[PDB]
Design a protein around this ligand. Structure first.
Ligand SMILES: [Ca+2]
Length: 123
């Protein structure tokens, strides 16, 4: 099927600011900076994921997804973090990379969703 999942069950599945604060010593400034740094990293990941999706077989995909997974842990982006877990764990279990295209497309979508939520959160 061409379809991927576009249902986000609740906007806190995209950005959970109370989770973000809980991971940043309860500090607004640190949670701010960590979210900013995540947003500034996403385009590098987007570009690699797009290359993968069009058959360029880029080097370093799983290691970059792993890095994004870790980065998510410093903030509060549950859907994104879990997408990274799905992608990496499937890749580690030997799944052909082409089979994971739906999750890669969902990750691209979630990058946009996170940016939208991030642009509002501190007002
Ligand atoms: Ca922590």
């Amino acid at each position: 099927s061409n379809a991927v999942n576009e249902i986000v069950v609740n906007p806190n599945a995209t950005l959970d600011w109370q989770l973000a604060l809980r991971q940043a010593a309860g500090k607004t400034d640190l949670a701010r900076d960590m979210l900013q740094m995540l947003l500034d990293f996403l385009p590098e990941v987007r570009n690699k994921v797009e290359e993968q999706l069009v058959g360029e077989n880029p080097e370093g995909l799983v290691d970059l997804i792993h890095k994004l997974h870790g980065s998510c842990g410093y903030s509060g982006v549950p859907r994104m973090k879990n997408l990274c877990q799905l992608i990496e764990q499937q890749l580690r279990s030997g799944t052909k990379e082409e089979d994971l295209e739906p999750e890669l497309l969902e990750l691209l979508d979630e990058m946009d969703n996170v940016a939208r939520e991030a642009s509002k959160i501190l007002g």
